[PDB]
Amino acid sequence: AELLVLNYGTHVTTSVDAGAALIQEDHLRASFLQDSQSSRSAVTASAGLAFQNTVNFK
Amino acid sequence: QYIIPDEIFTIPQKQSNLEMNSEILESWANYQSSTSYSINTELSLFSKVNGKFSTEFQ
Amino acid sequence: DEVGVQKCKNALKLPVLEVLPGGGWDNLRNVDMGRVMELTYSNCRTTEDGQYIIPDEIFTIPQKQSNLEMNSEILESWANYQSSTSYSINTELSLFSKVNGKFSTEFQRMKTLQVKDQAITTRVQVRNLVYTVKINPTLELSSGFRKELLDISDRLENNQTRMATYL
Amino acid sequence: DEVGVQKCKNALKLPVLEVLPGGGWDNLRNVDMGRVMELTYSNCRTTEDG
Amino acid sequence: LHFFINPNMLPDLPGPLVKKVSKTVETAVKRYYTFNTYPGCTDLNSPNFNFQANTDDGSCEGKMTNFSFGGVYQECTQLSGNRDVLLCQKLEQKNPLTGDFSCPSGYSPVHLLSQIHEEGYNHLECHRKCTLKVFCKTVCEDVFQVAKAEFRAFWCVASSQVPENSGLLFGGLFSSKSINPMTNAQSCPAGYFPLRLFENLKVCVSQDYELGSRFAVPFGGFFSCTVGNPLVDPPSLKKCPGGFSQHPALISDGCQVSYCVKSGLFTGGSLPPARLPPFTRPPLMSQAATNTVIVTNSENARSWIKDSQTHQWRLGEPIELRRAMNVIHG
Amino acid sequence: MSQAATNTVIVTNSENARSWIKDSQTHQWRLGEPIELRRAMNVIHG
Amino acid sequence: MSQAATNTVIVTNSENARSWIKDSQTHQWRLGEPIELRRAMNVIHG
Amino acid sequence: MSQAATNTVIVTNSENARSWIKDSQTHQWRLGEPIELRRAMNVIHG
Amino acid sequence: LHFFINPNMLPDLPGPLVKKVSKTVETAVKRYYTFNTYPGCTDLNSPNFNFQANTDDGS
Amino acid sequence: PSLKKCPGGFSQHPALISDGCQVSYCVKSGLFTGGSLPPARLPPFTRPPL
Ligand SMILES: *[C@@H]1O[C@H](CO)[C@@H](O[C@@H]2O[C@H](CO)[C@@H](O)[C@H](O)[C@H]2NC(C)=O)[C@H](O)[C@H]1NC(C)=O
Numbered sequence A: 001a002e003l004l005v006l007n008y009g010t011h012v013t014t015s016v017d018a019g020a021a022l023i024q025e026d027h028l029r030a031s032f033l034q035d036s037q038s039s040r041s042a043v044t045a046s047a048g049l050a051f052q053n054t055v056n057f058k
Numbered sequence B: 001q002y003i004i005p006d007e008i009f010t011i012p013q014k015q016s017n018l019e020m021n022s023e024i025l026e027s028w029a030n031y032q033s034s035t036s037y038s039i040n041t042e043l044s045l046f047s048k049v050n051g052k053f054s055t056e057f058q
Numbered sequence C: 001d002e003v004g005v006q007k008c009k010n011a012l013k014l015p016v017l018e019v020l021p022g023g024g025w026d027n028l029r030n031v032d033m034g035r036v037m038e039l040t041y042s043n044c045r046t047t048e049d050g051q052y053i054i055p056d057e058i059f060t061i062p063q064k065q066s067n068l069e070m071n072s073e074i075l076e077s078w079a080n081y082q083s084s085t086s087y088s089i090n091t092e093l094s095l096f097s098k099v100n101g102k103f104s105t106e107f108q109r110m111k112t113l114q115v116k117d118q119a120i121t122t123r124v125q126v127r128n129l130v131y132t133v134k135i136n137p138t139l140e141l142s143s144g145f146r147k148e149l150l151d152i153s154d155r156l157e158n159n160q161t162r163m164a165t166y167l
Numbered sequence D: 001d002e003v004g005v006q007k008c009k010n011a012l013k014l015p016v017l018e019v020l021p022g023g024g025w026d027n028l029r030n031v032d033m034g035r036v037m038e039l040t041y042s043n044c045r046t047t048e049d050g
Numbered sequence E: 001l002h003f004f005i006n007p008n009m010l011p012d013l014p015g016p017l018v019k020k021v022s023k024t025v026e027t028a029v030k031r032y033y034t035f036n037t038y039p040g041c042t043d044l045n046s047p048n049f050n051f052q053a054n055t056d057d058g059s060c061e062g063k064m065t066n067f068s069f070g071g072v073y074q075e076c077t078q079l080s081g082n083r084d085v086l087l088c089q090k091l092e093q094k095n096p097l098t099g100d101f102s103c104p105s106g107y108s109p110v111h112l113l114s115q116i117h118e119e120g121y122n123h124l125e126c127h128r129k130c131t132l133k134v135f136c137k138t139v140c141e142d143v144f145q146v147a148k149a150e151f152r153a154f155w156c157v158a159s160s161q162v163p164e165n166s167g168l169l170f171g172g173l174f175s176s177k178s179i180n181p182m183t184n185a186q187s188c189p190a191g192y193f194p195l196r197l198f199e200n201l202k203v204c205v206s207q208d209y210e211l212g213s214r215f216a217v218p219f220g221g222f223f224s225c226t227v228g229n230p231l232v233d234p235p236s237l238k239k240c241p242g243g244f245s246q247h248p249a250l251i252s253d254g255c256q257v258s259y260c261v262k263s264g265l266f267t268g269g270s271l272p273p274a275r276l277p278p279f280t281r282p283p284l285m286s287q288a289a290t291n292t293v294i295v296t297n298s299e300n301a302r303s304w305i306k307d308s309q310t311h312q313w314r315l316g317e318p319i320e321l322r323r324a325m326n327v328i329h330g
Numbered sequence F, G, H: 001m002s003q004a005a006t007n008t009v010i011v012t013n014s015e016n017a018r019s020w021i022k023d024s025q026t027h028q029w030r031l032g033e034p035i036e037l038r039r040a041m042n043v044i045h046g
Numbered sequence I: 001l002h003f004f005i006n007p008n009m010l011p012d013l014p015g016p017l018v019k020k021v022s023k024t025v026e027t028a029v030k031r032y033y034t035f036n037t038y039p040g041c042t043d044l045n046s047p048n049f050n051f052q053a054n055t056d057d058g059s
Numbered sequence J: 001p002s003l004k005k006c007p008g009g010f011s012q013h014p015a016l017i018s019d020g021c022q023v024s025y026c027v028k029s030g031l032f033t034g035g036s037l038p039p040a041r042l043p044p045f046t047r048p049p050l
C-alpha cells in the first residue's frame, strides 16, 4: 500500500486549468514595508510598474 | 482545435487577467502556490503541510 | 459510415457553438458541473445565420447586442454583490439567495480587498452579447445522469435510506 | 435525399432570415420563449429581393 | 436540480418512486447550503467584526457578558452486543465539577444531541476434520457483527445567577478530523485535560485559574440543529449570545454542532473553501467470511468436484481453497 | 475401492443479502446464488 | 394521492424443489428461482 | 410427488387508478393491467 | 486517492474486500503526512527559531 | 497522561522508526536546527517481514 503512494501520490487530479502565466517574484527587505499603510499601496504599485517595464523594454 | 479523450469534457473560458499591482506575502506560513493553489487549500487535518516540500516553497 | 459531430463538420465545414446549456451548475462556487441533458447532433442543425453547428434540442436567439459604458459603477459593500458573469442564476428567489456565489473566486478576491484595504470597488465593462442559447422543453436526460438516478432509485426500493442519502 | 433547411441552402447558397415570428414571448420580462408555431422549409421560398 | 426529476423525464419508473428520488436530492442540495452558511457580524467598522462570515447576523453591537462554563457530561446506553465490545466504557464522560452525571448546584443541564453509535466486533471459529486418513478438511469462519449504543450528551448552564467561581476556564475543541486553534494541533494546551464528547470531540478544560488563564478564552455556549443555547434570552434561539462568533464543531450524522467564542484568533485568517459533499458515511453491515481448504495427503487418490449446478464435473487438485463472503444489509 | 461423497448446500433465507464466491485459486470472484449445491467425489485406490 | 406498495418474497428452503411461474396472461411459463421478489405500486387519483 | 399450485388475481375496480409491476429482480418496471392472474406450480421430489 | 477505491470502480471484487483496500491505502497516505511534519518555533525573530520546521508549535 | 509535545524552548528531532512508530528527542543546540531544508521522507517506511 505504501508503494502505491510512492508511484501514484496522495491525490487524483479531477480538474485542471489549461493556460499560461508570466510571474514576477521580488524579495524586499522587511524594513522597507514598515513605514505605513499608505506606503504599502505605493510599494505595491511600484512592483507592477517594474514588471511592465521588464516585459516591454529590452 | 484539440483532440481530447472520450471521458473528458472541456469548458471554454477564454479568460485573461492582468494586474497593475502586486501582492505582498510577508510570511511563509500563509503561502500561495500560484500553480496548484486549489488542491493545496482543501479542508483536512494536514492542510498546513500541503506543498511544504515543493521546490517553489522551499 | 460516420456519426456524431464529425459528420456535421465534414458536410458543413464550420465550427460548433461552444457555449451550451443543459450542464450542471454549482451555485455556491459559480463553477459548472457534469452534463445533465443529452446533446445529440443527428439533424445537422446550424444557427439561422449559418455559422455554428448546434445540437438538435437547442434553439438560439440572435441578439447581436453591444454595450459600452462611458461611466463606472460603485460597489461600496460586498453584501450587494454583482457577479458579472453569472448574475441571473444567483439572483433567484429562494431561502439561500444571500449565499449564492459566496464561495466563488471572483467574490472571495473582492471581499479580501475591501476588508484588508478598507476599500470600495468600481467596475467598468464593455459587454458584447451575441446569442441567447436555450433548451427546448421536450429534452431528455443524459446517459450518465440517468444511471446515477437509477442507482438512488434502487436503494429507495430496498428500504435503504442511509445508503440512498449517501448517493 | 436531403431535407429541411439544408436542402434550401445547397440549391440557393444564401442565408436564412434569422428574425422570425411565431415564438413565445414573456411580456413582463421582454424575453422570448419556445416556439409555438411550426416552421417548415419545404417550398424553398426566398424573399422577393432574393 | 430536483426540478428535472419528475415523471416526464423518467418514464420507465413508477410515479411515486421518482418523487422519492426528487425529495432525497432536494434534501441533499438544501443540506449543502446549510453547512456553508456562516452568520456573523459583517460590518467592518464594528469592533466585533466577523471575518469569515457570509450572512448578516443582525447583532453588530454586543454587551460583553462573561459567562460560566459548567462542564459537559455524556451518558451511554448499550443496545446490542453485550460482553463483546463494552461500548458504554470508552463513550462515557462524567462532569469534573461533580464527578457525576449532573450539573453543580448553581447550574442546570441542557440536552445537546442524542444519536446511535455503531462499532464492529469479530468472531473467528475453526475446526478440522479428516476422512479416511487422506482428505483433510479445514473450515475457518469469521463473523463480523455490529454493536450499537445510544449516547446522550448534556451541557451545563449558569441558571442560578450567583456563582462563586465559574469553573473550567476554556472552551476550545478538537475532533478526530479537526484542530484546536489554541495549539494548532490535536492536543491540549499547557495544563489542560480533555473531556470526551459525542464520538470524537475532546473539549480542553482546566480549573487552575493561574496557569489556565493564559489560554482561557471567553466561552459563549453550544447549540445544534435541534437545540438552542439559553444564553441569549435572559424554547431558545440557537443564534449566539451576542458579541461572540459561531464556530462549527464536528457533524454528527447530518446535524451540525456549533460553539461560540470571542477571541479574534478564531475569526481571522483566510476565507475557507466550501465544504463539499458527502457529509455522511455509508453505514456498517454485518458480514461473514469462510475459508474451506481440502488437503489430499496422498497420491493414488483422485477427486472430482462440481462447483455449482451450472458447472460441469471437474478433476480436483490437492489443495482447493474455496472462499465466500456473505453480507446482509441491516 | 473405498470412496467418499459430500454435498454442501447453502440456502439464503432472505433477500437483501448478497454473496460472493471464489470456487478455487484459478477461478475469479463470482456473484453467489441463493442455492449453491457443491459436490465432490473422493476415491482412493487401495 | 393515496398509494399502496406490496412486496411478495418466495424463498425455497431446499434443493430438489423445482418451480414454474407464469407472470401474467401474456407471459409464458418460466422456470422459477429460489428468491423471487415481486413488486407492485398502486396509485389512485383522488 | 407432492405439489402446490397458486393463483393470485388482482382486480382494479376503477379507472383513474394506475399500477406498476416489477415481476422479478431481472424484469423492469411494467405498467400494470386491470386483471393480472399470476400463476405458480411448486414441486418437491420426495 | 482512497476516494476512488470503492465498489463502483472495482466491480469484479466483493464489497467488504474493496473497503479493506481503501482503508489500507488511507492509512498509508496518512502515515506519509505524519512522517513529514516538523512542529517547532516558526517565528524568525524569536531566539529559539526552528529552521526546518513546518507547523507552528505555539511555543 | 503526558503531552508528547516538547519541554519548551527545545526542538524536536526524529530518531529512527520502529516499524511504523516514530521516536523523537528534544535538544537545544542550534547545531541540530540549521543547515538546509531536508527533502521529504518517501515511502515505504516498513520492510517486508522474514
Ligand atoms: C531600504 O529602505 C529604506 C526605507 O525604509 C531606505 O531608507 C531611506 O532612504 C532614503 C534614500 O536616501 C533616505 O532619504 C531616507 O532618509 C531613508 N530612511 C527612511 C526612513 O525613509 C533605505 O535607503 C533602503 N536601503 C538601501 C540599502 O537603500
Ligand SMILES: *[C@@H]1O[C@H](CO)[C@@H](O)[C@H](O)[C@H]1NC(C)=O
Binding pocket: C159
Ligand atoms: C424500513 O426500515 C426501517 C428500519 O427500522 C423501518 O423503520 C421502516 O418501517 C421500514 N419501512 C418499510 C416500508 O419496510
